[PDB]
Protein backbone atom coordinates (compact mmCIF):
# COMPACT_ATOMS: atom_id res chain seq x y z
CA UNK A 1 0.00 0.00 0.00
CA UNK A 2 1.45 3.32 -1.15
CA UNK A 3 0.19 6.75 -0.08
CA UNK A 4 0.23 9.50 -2.69
CA UNK A 5 -1.14 12.97 -1.85
CA UNK A 6 -3.74 12.55 -4.60
CA UNK A 7 -5.23 9.25 -3.41
CA UNK A 8 -4.56 9.55 0.35
CA UNK A 9 -5.17 13.20 1.33
CA UNK A 10 -5.52 12.35 5.03
CA UNK A 11 -2.79 9.77 5.65
CA UNK A 12 0.00 10.43 3.15
CA UNK A 13 2.03 12.58 5.56
CA UNK A 14 1.87 9.91 8.27
CA UNK A 15 5.32 8.86 9.40
CA UNK A 16 6.57 5.28 9.41
CA UNK A 17 7.61 5.38 13.08
CA UNK A 18 4.10 6.63 14.07
CA UNK A 19 5.53 9.85 15.41
CA UNK A 20 3.55 13.11 15.33
CA UNK A 21 4.20 15.53 12.48
CA UNK A 22 5.01 18.99 13.80
CA UNK A 23 4.78 22.40 12.17
CA UNK A 24 8.04 22.51 10.19
CA UNK A 25 7.61 18.98 8.84
CA UNK A 26 3.90 19.55 8.15
CA UNK A 27 4.61 22.77 6.25
CA UNK A 28 7.40 20.99 4.36
CA UNK A 29 4.83 18.60 2.85
CA UNK A 30 2.40 21.33 1.76
CA UNK A 31 1.01 22.34 5.14
CA UNK A 32 -1.26 25.36 5.68
CA UNK A 33 -1.35 25.91 1.92
CA UNK A 34 -5.11 25.46 1.76
CA UNK A 35 -5.38 27.76 4.77
CA UNK A 36 -3.25 30.37 3.00
CA UNK A 37 -5.34 30.13 -0.18
CA UNK A 38 -8.65 30.30 1.69
CA UNK A 39 -7.65 33.15 4.00
CA UNK A 40 -5.89 35.28 1.38
CA UNK A 41 -7.87 34.68 -1.80
CA UNK A 42 -11.44 33.67 -0.97
CA UNK A 43 -14.33 35.21 0.91
CA UNK A 44 -16.06 32.99 3.50
CA UNK A 45 -19.13 32.56 1.28
CA UNK A 46 -17.20 31.01 -1.59
CA UNK A 47 -15.30 28.76 0.84
CA UNK A 48 -18.67 27.49 2.10
CA UNK A 49 -19.81 27.08 -1.51
CA UNK A 50 -16.55 25.28 -2.41
CA UNK A 51 -17.04 22.83 0.46
CA UNK A 52 -20.68 22.36 -0.58
CA UNK A 53 -19.77 21.62 -4.22
CA UNK A 54 -17.01 19.30 -3.03
CA UNK A 55 -19.77 17.10 -1.65
CA UNK A 56 -18.07 16.63 1.70
CA UNK A 57 -20.39 14.76 4.05
CA UNK A 58 -20.25 14.43 7.81
CA UNK A 59 -17.67 11.87 8.90
CA UNK A 60 -19.09 11.65 12.42
CA UNK A 61 -21.45 8.93 11.27
CA UNK A 62 -24.60 10.56 9.91
CA UNK A 63 -23.31 11.78 6.55
CA UNK A 64 -24.96 15.20 6.55
CA UNK A 65 -23.60 17.68 4.03
CA UNK A 66 -20.94 19.91 5.58
CA UNK A 67 -21.44 22.83 3.21
CA UNK A 68 -25.20 22.69 3.77
CA UNK A 69 -24.64 22.75 7.54
CA UNK A 70 -22.26 25.70 7.15
CA UNK A 71 -24.72 27.59 4.95
CA UNK A 72 -27.41 27.43 7.66
CA UNK A 73 -25.65 29.99 9.84
CA UNK A 74 -27.61 33.26 10.05
CA UNK A 75 -26.88 35.85 7.39
CA UNK A 76 -27.22 38.95 9.57
CA UNK A 77 -24.11 40.85 10.62
CA UNK A 78 -25.62 41.64 14.03
CA UNK A 79 -24.68 38.13 15.21
CA UNK A 80 -20.92 38.60 15.04
CA UNK A 81 -20.11 36.10 17.82
CA UNK A 82 -19.73 32.61 16.38
CA UNK A 83 -18.40 29.25 17.48
CA UNK A 84 -16.85 26.28 15.73
CA UNK A 85 -16.72 23.06 17.74
CA UNK A 86 -14.67 20.02 16.79
CA UNK A 87 -16.32 16.81 18.00
CA UNK A 88 -13.25 14.92 19.18
CA UNK A 89 -15.36 12.85 21.59
CA UNK A 90 -15.29 9.52 19.67
CA UNK A 91 -16.84 7.25 22.27
CA UNK A 92 -18.51 4.73 19.96
CA UNK A 93 -17.19 1.20 20.58
CA UNK A 94 -15.25 0.13 17.52
CA UNK A 95 -14.15 3.66 16.57
CA UNK A 96 -10.49 4.68 16.67
CA UNK A 97 -10.10 6.97 13.64
CA UNK A 98 -9.99 10.35 15.38
CA UNK A 99 -7.31 9.08 17.77
CA UNK A 100 -5.10 8.31 14.78
CA UNK A 101 -5.86 11.68 13.19
CA UNK A 102 -5.16 13.78 16.30
CA UNK A 103 -2.27 11.78 17.73
CA UNK A 104 0.10 12.06 14.77
CA UNK A 105 -1.42 14.78 12.53
CA UNK A 106 -2.62 17.54 14.87
CA UNK A 107 -1.73 20.35 12.47
CA UNK A 108 -4.11 18.88 9.88
CA UNK A 109 -6.96 19.33 12.36
CA UNK A 110 -5.72 22.81 13.33
CA UNK A 111 -5.60 23.90 9.68
CA UNK A 112 -9.06 22.44 9.10
CA UNK A 113 -10.51 24.33 12.06
CA UNK A 114 -8.80 27.52 10.87
CA UNK A 115 -10.26 27.23 7.35
CA UNK A 116 -13.71 26.29 8.65
CA UNK A 117 -13.73 29.10 11.21
CA UNK A 118 -12.82 31.61 8.51
CA UNK A 119 -15.63 30.22 6.35
CA UNK A 120 -18.12 30.34 9.23
CA UNK A 121 -16.79 33.70 10.51
CA UNK A 122 -16.36 31.93 13.84
CA UNK A 123 -14.32 34.04 16.23
CA UNK A 124 -13.79 31.09 18.56
CA UNK A 125 -13.10 27.40 18.20
CA UNK A 126 -13.17 24.60 20.75
CA UNK A 127 -11.90 21.04 20.35
CA UNK A 128 -14.24 18.98 22.53
CA UNK A 129 -11.80 16.13 23.16
CA UNK A 130 -12.42 13.05 25.28
CA UNK A 131 -10.45 12.84 28.51
CA UNK A 132 -8.90 9.46 27.70
CA UNK A 133 -6.96 10.88 24.72
CA UNK A 134 -3.98 12.22 26.65
CA UNK A 135 -1.54 11.94 23.75
CA UNK A 136 -4.01 13.69 21.45
CA UNK A 137 -4.43 16.46 24.04
CA UNK A 138 -0.66 16.91 24.38
CA UNK A 139 -0.06 16.92 20.62
CA UNK A 140 -3.01 19.22 19.88
CA UNK A 141 -1.94 21.72 22.56
CA UNK A 142 1.62 21.64 21.21
CA UNK A 143 0.43 22.16 17.63
CA UNK A 144 -1.83 25.03 18.72
CA UNK A 145 1.15 26.63 20.48
CA UNK A 146 3.28 26.16 17.36
CA UNK A 147 0.61 27.67 15.10
CA UNK A 148 0.13 30.59 17.50
CA UNK A 149 3.89 31.21 17.50
CA UNK A 150 4.08 31.20 13.69
CA UNK A 151 1.13 33.59 13.24
CA UNK A 152 -1.32 30.89 12.12
CA UNK A 153 -3.61 31.36 15.14
CA UNK A 154 -4.56 34.32 17.30
CA UNK A 155 -4.77 37.94 16.20
CA UNK A 156 -4.25 39.06 12.58
CA UNK A 157 -3.77 35.62 11.05
CA UNK A 158 -1.70 35.92 7.84
CA UNK A 159 -2.29 39.68 7.82
CA UNK A 160 -5.94 39.17 6.86
CA UNK A 161 -7.43 40.79 9.96
CA UNK A 162 -9.16 37.55 10.96
CA UNK A 163 -9.01 36.73 14.67
CA UNK A 164 -9.32 33.11 15.77
CA UNK A 165 -8.67 31.52 19.16
CA UNK A 166 -8.49 27.73 19.39
CA UNK A 167 -9.01 26.00 22.74
CA UNK A 168 -8.96 22.35 23.80
CA UNK A 169 -11.71 21.20 26.19
CA UNK A 170 -10.93 17.78 27.67
CA UNK A 171 -13.95 15.70 28.60
CA UNK A 172 -14.91 13.84 31.75
CA UNK A 173 -16.07 10.56 30.26
CA UNK A 174 -19.62 10.14 28.99
CA UNK A 175 -20.57 8.72 25.61
CA UNK A 176 -23.59 11.02 25.24
CA UNK A 177 -21.24 14.03 25.17
CA UNK A 178 -20.48 13.23 21.54
CA UNK A 179 -24.05 14.03 20.52
CA UNK A 180 -23.76 17.54 19.17
CA UNK A 181 -26.35 19.31 21.33
CA UNK A 182 -25.24 17.36 24.39
CA UNK A 183 -21.71 18.34 23.37
CA UNK A 184 -22.81 21.98 23.41
CA UNK A 185 -24.42 21.52 26.83
CA UNK A 186 -21.24 19.88 28.15
CA UNK A 187 -19.11 22.70 26.71
CA UNK A 188 -21.32 25.15 28.63
CA UNK A 189 -20.47 23.31 31.85
CA UNK A 190 -23.83 21.58 32.26
CA UNK A 191 -25.02 18.00 32.37
CA UNK A 192 -24.71 16.63 28.85
CA UNK A 193 -28.32 16.20 27.94
CA UNK A 194 -29.12 16.67 24.25
CA UNK A 195 -31.45 19.40 23.05
CA UNK A 196 -34.48 19.36 20.81
CA UNK A 197 -34.00 20.42 17.20
CA UNK A 198 -35.24 22.82 15.75
CA UNK A 199 -33.56 25.16 16.56
CA UNK A 200 -30.39 23.65 15.21
CA UNK A 201 -27.00 24.79 16.59
CA UNK A 202 -26.43 26.82 13.41
CA UNK A 203 -28.89 29.46 14.63
CA UNK A 204 -28.72 29.16 18.44
CA UNK A 205 -26.09 26.76 19.76
CA UNK A 206 -23.30 27.36 22.24
CA UNK A 207 -24.41 30.10 24.67
CA UNK A 208 -27.22 30.95 22.24
CA UNK A 209 -24.77 31.96 19.51
CA UNK A 210 -24.50 30.46 16.03
CA UNK A 211 -22.44 27.31 16.36
CA UNK A 212 -21.22 24.61 14.00
CA UNK A 213 -20.26 21.17 15.31
CA UNK A 214 -18.14 19.04 12.99
CA UNK A 215 -16.28 15.75 13.35
CA UNK A 216 -12.48 15.53 13.48
CA UNK A 217 -12.31 13.74 10.13
CA UNK A 218 -14.60 16.26 8.39
CA UNK A 219 -12.40 19.17 9.43
CA UNK A 220 -9.37 17.11 8.43
CA UNK A 221 -11.00 16.69 5.01
CA UNK A 222 -11.49 20.45 4.39
CA UNK A 223 -7.81 21.55 3.96
CA UNK A 224 -7.14 19.13 1.11
CA UNK A 225 -10.28 20.48 -0.57
CA UNK A 226 -9.02 24.03 -0.16
CA UNK A 227 -5.50 23.16 -1.35
CA UNK A 228 -6.09 20.76 -4.26
CA UNK A 229 -9.44 22.16 -5.40
CA UNK A 230 -13.03 20.95 -5.63
CA UNK A 231 -12.49 19.12 -8.93
CA UNK A 232 -9.76 16.93 -7.45
CA UNK A 233 -12.05 15.98 -4.56
CA UNK A 234 -14.97 15.08 -6.82
CA UNK A 235 -12.80 12.77 -8.95
CA UNK A 236 -11.34 10.76 -6.06
CA UNK A 237 -13.91 8.03 -6.72
CA UNK A 238 -16.91 7.46 -8.98
CA UNK A 239 -19.39 7.15 -6.12
CA UNK A 240 -22.22 9.27 -4.76
CA UNK A 241 -20.20 9.87 -1.58
CA UNK A 242 -17.22 12.03 -2.50
CA UNK A 243 -13.72 11.87 -1.10
CA UNK A 244 -11.89 9.36 1.03
CA UNK A 245 -13.08 7.77 4.26
CA UNK A 246 -11.02 6.21 7.02
CA UNK A 247 -12.30 2.63 6.97
CA UNK A 248 -11.12 -0.42 8.85
CA UNK A 249 -11.88 -3.80 10.31
CA UNK A 250 -11.34 -4.87 13.91
CA UNK A 251 -11.77 -7.99 16.00
CA UNK A 252 -9.89 -11.30 15.63
CA UNK A 253 -8.76 -10.54 12.09
CA UNK A 254 -5.18 -11.09 10.96
CA UNK A 255 -4.41 -7.36 10.59
CA UNK A 256 -6.85 -5.19 12.56
CA UNK A 257 -6.40 -1.57 11.67
CA UNK A 258 -7.29 1.58 9.81
CA UNK A 259 -6.81 2.55 6.16
CA UNK A 260 -7.86 5.53 4.08
CA UNK A 261 -10.01 4.27 1.22
CA UNK A 262 -12.34 5.84 -1.35
CA UNK A 263 -16.06 5.49 -0.79
CA UNK A 264 -17.52 2.46 -2.52
CA UNK A 265 -14.85 -0.12 -1.75
CA UNK A 266 -16.51 -3.34 -0.66
CA UNK A 267 -16.34 -4.65 2.88
CA UNK A 268 -14.77 -7.85 1.56
CA UNK A 269 -11.94 -5.77 0.11
CA UNK A 270 -11.30 -4.28 3.55
CA UNK A 271 -11.66 -7.64 5.32
CA UNK A 272 -9.40 -9.76 3.11
CA UNK A 273 -6.98 -7.44 1.30
CA UNK A 274 -6.42 -4.96 4.14
CA UNK A 275 -7.44 -6.72 7.36
CA UNK A 276 -5.97 -10.01 6.13
CA UNK A 277 -9.14 -12.02 6.63
CA UNK A 278 -10.17 -13.82 9.77
CA UNK A 279 -7.56 -15.30 12.07
CA UNK A 280 -6.51 -18.94 11.81
CA UNK A 281 -9.11 -21.40 13.04
CA UNK A 282 -11.88 -18.78 13.11
CA UNK A 283 -14.83 -18.70 10.72
CA UNK A 284 -16.60 -15.47 9.79
CA UNK A 285 -20.06 -15.20 11.34
CA UNK A 286 -21.19 -11.56 11.21
CA UNK A 287 -19.98 -7.98 11.04
CA UNK A 288 -21.02 -4.53 12.18
CA UNK A 289 -20.27 -1.90 9.51
CA UNK A 290 -20.03 1.35 11.42
CA UNK A 291 -19.62 0.95 15.16
CA UNK A 292 -21.61 -0.36 18.08
CA UNK A 293 -24.79 1.44 17.03
CA UNK A 294 -25.21 -0.21 13.63
CA UNK A 295 -27.10 -3.33 12.59
CA UNK A 296 -25.30 -6.65 12.22
CA UNK A 297 -24.75 -7.99 8.71
CA UNK A 298 -23.91 -11.49 7.52
CA UNK A 299 -21.34 -12.91 5.09
CA UNK A 300 -23.74 -12.33 2.18
CA UNK A 301 -23.50 -8.56 2.73
CA UNK A 302 -19.70 -8.55 2.55
CA UNK A 303 -19.84 -7.80 -1.19
CA UNK A 304 -21.47 -4.43 -0.56
CA UNK A 305 -19.80 -1.08 -1.30
CA UNK A 306 -19.08 0.92 1.85
CA UNK A 307 -21.40 3.82 1.05
CA UNK A 308 -24.22 5.40 3.03
CA UNK A 309 -26.89 4.39 0.52
CA UNK A 310 -25.76 0.81 -0.17
CA UNK A 311 -25.33 -0.10 3.51
CA UNK A 312 -28.60 1.72 4.21
CA UNK A 313 -30.59 -0.47 1.81
CA UNK A 314 -29.21 -3.61 3.49
CA UNK A 315 -30.93 -2.64 6.74
CA UNK A 316 -27.87 -1.13 8.42
CA UNK A 317 -25.87 2.10 8.58
CA UNK A 318 -22.45 3.01 7.24
CA UNK A 319 -21.80 4.81 10.53
CA UNK A 320 -18.15 5.44 11.29
CA UNK A 321 -17.18 2.90 8.56
CA UNK A 322 -14.97 1.10 11.12
CA UNK A 323 -16.34 -2.42 10.80
CA UNK A 324 -16.05 -5.13 13.43
CA UNK A 325 -15.90 -8.83 12.62
CA UNK A 326 -17.68 -11.47 14.70
CA UNK A 327 -16.28 -14.99 14.45
CA UNK A 328 -18.09 -18.27 15.06
CA UNK A 329 -16.78 -18.62 18.63
CA UNK A 330 -18.70 -15.53 19.79
CA UNK A 331 -22.15 -16.11 21.24
CA UNK A 332 -24.45 -13.47 19.78
CA UNK A 333 -26.55 -13.22 22.95
CA UNK A 334 -23.44 -12.41 25.00
CA UNK A 335 -22.28 -9.88 22.39
CA UNK A 336 -25.64 -8.10 22.31
CA UNK A 337 -25.76 -8.21 26.12
CA UNK A 338 -22.38 -6.46 26.23
CA UNK A 339 -23.55 -3.88 23.68
CA UNK A 340 -26.81 -3.20 25.52
CA UNK A 341 -25.02 -2.95 28.87
CA UNK A 342 -22.85 -0.23 27.35
CA UNK A 343 -25.86 1.52 25.81
CA UNK A 344 -28.02 1.36 28.95
CA UNK A 345 -25.29 2.64 31.23
CA UNK A 346 -24.45 5.44 28.78
CA UNK A 347 -28.01 6.75 28.76
CA UNK A 348 -28.15 10.37 29.82
CA UNK A 349 -31.41 9.72 31.68
CA UNK A 350 -33.45 12.46 30.02
CA UNK A 351 -36.14 10.39 28.32
CA UNK A 352 -38.16 7.38 29.47
CA UNK A 353 -37.77 4.82 26.60
CA UNK A 354 -33.97 4.80 26.59
CA UNK A 355 -33.43 5.28 30.34
CA UNK A 356 -36.00 2.68 31.43
CA UNK A 357 -36.23 0.34 28.45
CA UNK A 358 -32.57 -0.31 27.74
CA UNK A 359 -32.07 -1.77 31.28
CA UNK A 360 -35.06 -4.06 30.69
CA UNK A 361 -33.37 -5.38 27.55
CA UNK A 362 -30.13 -5.74 29.54
CA UNK A 363 -31.85 -7.86 32.19
CA UNK A 364 -33.61 -9.97 29.54
CA UNK A 365 -30.31 -10.60 27.76
CA UNK A 366 -28.63 -11.45 31.07
CA UNK A 367 -31.35 -14.03 31.70
CA UNK A 368 -30.98 -15.40 28.15
CA UNK A 369 -27.21 -15.71 28.56
CA UNK A 370 -27.70 -17.63 31.82
CA UNK A 371 -30.41 -19.84 30.33
CA UNK A 372 -33.04 -18.26 32.59
CA UNK A 373 -35.12 -16.77 29.79
CA UNK A 374 -38.89 -17.13 29.94
CA UNK A 375 -41.49 -17.06 27.14
CA UNK A 376 -42.29 -13.56 25.97
CA UNK A 377 -38.71 -12.34 26.47
CA UNK A 378 -37.86 -12.26 22.75
CA UNK A 379 -41.17 -10.58 21.92
CA UNK A 380 -40.38 -8.02 24.62
CA UNK A 381 -36.99 -7.42 23.00
CA UNK A 382 -38.64 -6.98 19.59
CA UNK A 383 -41.22 -4.55 21.00
CA UNK A 384 -38.39 -2.65 22.71
CA UNK A 385 -36.60 -2.41 19.36
CA UNK A 386 -39.78 -1.13 17.72
CA UNK A 387 -40.59 1.43 20.42
CA UNK A 388 -37.05 2.80 20.82
CA UNK A 389 -36.68 3.66 17.14
CA UNK A 390 -36.18 7.10 15.59
CA UNK A 391 -38.58 9.71 16.90
CA UNK A 392 -39.72 7.70 19.92
CA UNK A 393 -36.80 8.94 22.02
CA UNK A 394 -35.41 12.41 22.54
CA UNK A 395 -32.11 11.74 20.74
CA UNK A 396 -30.60 9.06 18.52
CA UNK A 397 -28.71 7.17 21.25
CA UNK A 398 -31.49 4.61 21.74
CA UNK A 399 -32.21 3.88 18.03
CA UNK A 400 -28.51 3.14 17.69
CA UNK A 401 -28.76 1.05 20.85
CA UNK A 402 -31.54 -1.12 19.42
CA UNK A 403 -30.08 -1.57 15.92
CA UNK A 404 -27.71 -4.47 16.89
CA UNK A 405 -30.38 -6.11 19.06
CA UNK A 406 -32.98 -6.19 16.30
CA UNK A 407 -30.46 -7.30 13.68
CA UNK A 408 -29.11 -10.08 15.89
CA UNK A 409 -32.65 -11.29 16.59
CA UNK A 410 -33.34 -11.14 12.85
CA UNK A 411 -30.23 -13.07 11.76
CA UNK A 412 -29.43 -15.25 14.82
CA UNK A 413 -32.80 -15.96 16.43
CA UNK A 414 -31.82 -19.56 17.24
CA UNK A 415 -29.27 -18.36 19.80
CA UNK A 416 -31.87 -16.20 21.55
CA UNK A 417 -34.42 -19.03 21.74
CA UNK A 418 -31.72 -21.25 23.27
CA UNK A 419 -31.81 -19.12 26.43
CA UNK A 420 -35.55 -19.60 27.05
CA UNK A 421 -35.64 -22.56 29.43
CA UNK A 422 -37.91 -21.65 32.35
CA UNK A 423 -41.67 -21.07 32.17
CA UNK A 424 -42.86 -17.51 32.56
CA UNK A 425 -43.48 -16.67 36.21
CA UNK A 426 -44.02 -13.16 37.55
CA UNK A 427 -46.00 -13.90 40.72
CA UNK A 428 -45.56 -15.95 43.84
CA UNK A 429 -48.42 -17.86 45.43
CA UNK A 430 -50.43 -16.01 48.07
CA UNK A 431 -52.07 -18.44 50.47
CA UNK A 432 -55.82 -17.94 50.67
CA UNK A 433 -56.18 -16.20 47.30
CA UNK A 434 -56.89 -18.28 44.22
CA UNK A 435 -55.10 -16.94 41.12
CA UNK A 436 -56.84 -15.91 37.90
CA UNK A 437 -55.47 -18.65 35.66
CA UNK A 438 -55.28 -17.35 32.09
CA UNK A 439 -55.56 -19.70 29.12
Amino acid sequence: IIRTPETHPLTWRLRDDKQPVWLDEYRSKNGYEGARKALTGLSPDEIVNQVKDAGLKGRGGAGFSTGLKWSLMPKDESMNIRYLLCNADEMEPGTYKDRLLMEQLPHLLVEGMLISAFALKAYRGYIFLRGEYIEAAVNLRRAIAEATEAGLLGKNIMGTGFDFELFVHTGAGRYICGEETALINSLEGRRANPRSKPPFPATSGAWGKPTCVNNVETLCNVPAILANGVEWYQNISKSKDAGTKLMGFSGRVKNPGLWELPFGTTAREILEDYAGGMRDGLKFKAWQPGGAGTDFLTEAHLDLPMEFESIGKAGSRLGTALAMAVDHEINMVSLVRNLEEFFARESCGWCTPCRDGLPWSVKILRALERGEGQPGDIETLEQLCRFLGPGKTFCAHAPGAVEPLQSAIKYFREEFEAGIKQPFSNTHLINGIQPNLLK
Binding site: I81, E90, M91, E92, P93, G94, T95, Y96, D98, R99, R130, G131, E132, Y133, I134, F167, H169, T170, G171, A172, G173, R174, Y175, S186, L187, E188, G189, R190, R191, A192, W207, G248, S250, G251, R252, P256, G257, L258, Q288, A292, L322, M324, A325, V326, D327, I330, S334, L335, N338, L339, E341, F342, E346
Partner: protein, 156 residues
Protein backbone atom coordinates in the same frame (compact mmCIF):
# COMPACT_ATOMS: atom_id res chain seq x y z
CA UNK B 1 -13.32 21.98 56.12
CA UNK B 2 -12.36 22.29 52.45
CA UNK B 3 -10.22 25.12 51.12
CA UNK B 4 -9.08 25.48 47.53
CA UNK B 5 -5.33 25.90 47.23
CA UNK B 6 -3.79 28.86 45.42
CA UNK B 7 -2.77 26.66 42.49
CA UNK B 8 -6.29 25.22 42.22
CA UNK B 9 -7.93 28.65 42.41
CA UNK B 10 -5.59 30.21 39.83
CA UNK B 11 -6.10 27.24 37.49
CA UNK B 12 -9.88 27.55 37.81
CA UNK B 13 -9.81 31.30 37.09
CA UNK B 14 -7.48 30.78 34.12
CA UNK B 15 -9.97 28.28 32.74
CA UNK B 16 -12.75 30.77 33.46
CA UNK B 17 -11.02 33.15 31.04
CA UNK B 18 -11.47 30.67 28.16
CA UNK B 19 -15.26 31.03 27.84
CA UNK B 20 -17.94 33.70 27.80
CA UNK B 21 -19.65 32.06 30.79
CA UNK B 22 -17.81 30.98 33.97
CA UNK B 23 -20.22 28.02 34.27
CA UNK B 24 -18.36 26.45 31.33
CA UNK B 25 -15.32 25.95 33.59
CA UNK B 26 -17.19 23.63 35.98
CA UNK B 27 -16.04 20.34 34.43
CA UNK B 28 -12.41 21.41 34.32
CA UNK B 29 -12.62 22.90 37.84
CA UNK B 30 -13.77 19.50 39.09
CA UNK B 31 -10.97 17.90 37.06
CA UNK B 32 -8.42 20.29 38.61
CA UNK B 33 -9.55 19.41 42.14
CA UNK B 34 -9.54 15.71 41.20
CA UNK B 35 -6.04 15.97 39.71
CA UNK B 36 -4.74 17.61 42.87
CA UNK B 37 -6.48 15.39 45.43
CA UNK B 38 -7.35 12.12 43.62
CA UNK B 39 -11.10 12.77 43.79
CA UNK B 40 -13.58 15.58 44.44
CA UNK B 41 -14.56 15.71 48.15
CA UNK B 42 -17.86 17.10 49.41
CA UNK B 43 -16.64 20.59 50.35
CA UNK B 44 -15.02 20.96 46.95
CA UNK B 45 -18.51 21.19 45.43
CA UNK B 46 -19.34 24.29 47.45
CA UNK B 47 -15.86 25.78 46.95
CA UNK B 48 -16.02 25.36 43.16
CA UNK B 49 -19.59 26.71 43.12
CA UNK B 50 -18.47 29.76 45.10
CA UNK B 51 -15.59 30.41 42.71
CA UNK B 52 -17.71 30.04 39.56
CA UNK B 53 -20.76 31.86 40.92
CA UNK B 54 -23.13 29.00 40.05
CA UNK B 55 -25.20 26.97 42.57
CA UNK B 56 -23.71 23.97 44.32
CA UNK B 57 -26.60 21.88 42.98
CA UNK B 58 -25.38 22.52 39.42
CA UNK B 59 -21.79 21.61 40.37
CA UNK B 60 -22.92 18.39 42.04
CA UNK B 61 -25.17 17.52 39.10
CA UNK B 62 -22.17 17.91 36.82
CA UNK B 63 -19.88 15.94 39.16
CA UNK B 64 -22.31 13.02 39.47
CA UNK B 65 -23.20 13.09 35.77
CA UNK B 66 -19.68 12.47 34.46
CA UNK B 67 -18.14 9.09 35.16
CA UNK B 68 -14.51 10.24 35.35
CA UNK B 69 -15.22 12.82 38.06
CA UNK B 70 -14.88 10.79 41.25
CA UNK B 71 -17.15 11.74 44.14
CA UNK B 72 -15.92 8.81 46.27
CA UNK B 73 -12.31 8.25 47.40
CA UNK B 74 -10.20 6.12 45.08
CA UNK B 75 -6.79 4.49 45.27
CA UNK B 76 -3.46 5.94 44.23
CA UNK B 77 -3.79 4.42 40.75
CA UNK B 78 -7.07 3.98 38.89
CA UNK B 79 -7.12 0.98 36.57
CA UNK B 80 -9.74 1.40 33.85
CA UNK B 81 -10.22 -1.74 31.78
CA UNK B 82 -12.34 -1.52 28.65
CA UNK B 83 -15.43 -3.74 28.73
CA UNK B 84 -16.86 -2.73 25.35
CA UNK B 85 -17.70 -4.90 22.37
CA UNK B 86 -14.41 -5.23 20.47
CA UNK B 87 -12.42 -5.89 23.64
CA UNK B 88 -15.12 -8.40 24.58
CA UNK B 89 -14.46 -10.11 21.24
CA UNK B 90 -10.73 -9.83 21.96
CA UNK B 91 -11.24 -11.32 25.42
CA UNK B 92 -11.33 -8.64 28.10
CA UNK B 93 -12.90 -11.19 30.47
CA UNK B 94 -9.57 -12.93 30.98
CA UNK B 95 -7.97 -9.55 31.67
CA UNK B 96 -10.68 -8.69 34.21
CA UNK B 97 -10.28 -12.11 35.86
CA UNK B 98 -6.50 -11.64 36.05
CA UNK B 99 -6.89 -8.15 37.55
CA UNK B 100 -9.43 -9.43 40.09
CA UNK B 101 -7.15 -12.32 41.05
CA UNK B 102 -4.08 -10.11 41.42
CA UNK B 103 -5.81 -7.32 43.34
CA UNK B 104 -8.33 -9.48 45.28
CA UNK B 105 -11.10 -6.92 44.71
CA UNK B 106 -14.19 -6.45 42.56
CA UNK B 107 -14.77 -3.73 39.94
CA UNK B 108 -15.60 -0.44 41.58
CA UNK B 109 -13.60 -1.39 44.68
CA UNK B 110 -10.27 -0.21 46.06
CA UNK B 111 -7.52 -2.45 47.43
CA UNK B 112 -7.10 -2.38 51.20
CA UNK B 113 -3.73 -0.59 50.99
CA UNK B 114 -5.21 2.18 48.84
CA UNK B 115 -2.98 1.42 45.86
CA UNK B 116 -5.37 0.42 43.08
CA UNK B 117 -8.99 1.17 42.23
CA UNK B 118 -10.38 -1.22 39.62
CA UNK B 119 -12.99 0.19 37.26
CA UNK B 120 -14.67 -0.87 34.03
CA UNK B 121 -14.76 1.81 31.39
CA UNK B 122 -16.36 2.24 28.01
CA UNK B 123 -14.39 1.84 24.78
CA UNK B 124 -11.01 3.55 24.96
CA UNK B 125 -10.83 4.15 21.20
CA UNK B 126 -8.06 1.58 20.74
CA UNK B 127 -10.12 -1.32 19.46
CA UNK B 128 -7.67 -2.51 16.81
CA UNK B 129 -5.12 -3.17 19.59
CA UNK B 130 -7.44 -4.72 22.16
CA UNK B 131 -7.98 -5.70 24.86
CA UNK B 132 -7.09 -2.33 26.36
CA UNK B 133 -6.87 -0.88 29.83
CA UNK B 134 -5.88 2.44 31.34
CA UNK B 135 -3.77 3.07 34.39
CA UNK B 136 -3.86 6.72 35.50
CA UNK B 137 -2.73 8.37 32.28
CA UNK B 138 -1.14 5.40 30.47
CA UNK B 139 -3.03 3.13 28.08
CA UNK B 140 -1.87 -0.48 27.77
CA UNK B 141 -2.86 -2.47 24.70
CA UNK B 142 -2.52 -6.09 23.52
CA UNK B 143 -3.18 -7.29 27.04
CA UNK B 144 -2.80 -10.90 28.15
CA UNK B 145 -3.66 -12.35 31.58
CA UNK B 146 -0.01 -13.35 32.04
CA UNK B 147 1.33 -9.80 31.61
CA UNK B 148 -1.13 -8.32 34.14
CA UNK B 149 0.85 -9.06 37.37
CA UNK B 150 4.10 -7.75 35.87
CA UNK B 151 2.49 -4.67 34.34
CA UNK B 152 0.66 -3.77 37.56
CA UNK B 153 3.90 -3.92 39.55
CA UNK B 154 5.38 -0.77 37.99
CA UNK B 155 2.71 1.42 39.64
CA UNK B 156 3.71 1.79 43.28
Amino acid sequence: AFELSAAEREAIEHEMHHYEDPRAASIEALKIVQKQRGWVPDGAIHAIADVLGIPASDVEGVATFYSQIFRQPVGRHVIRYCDSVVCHINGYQGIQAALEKKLNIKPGQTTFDGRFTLLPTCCLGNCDKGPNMMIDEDTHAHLTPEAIPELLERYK
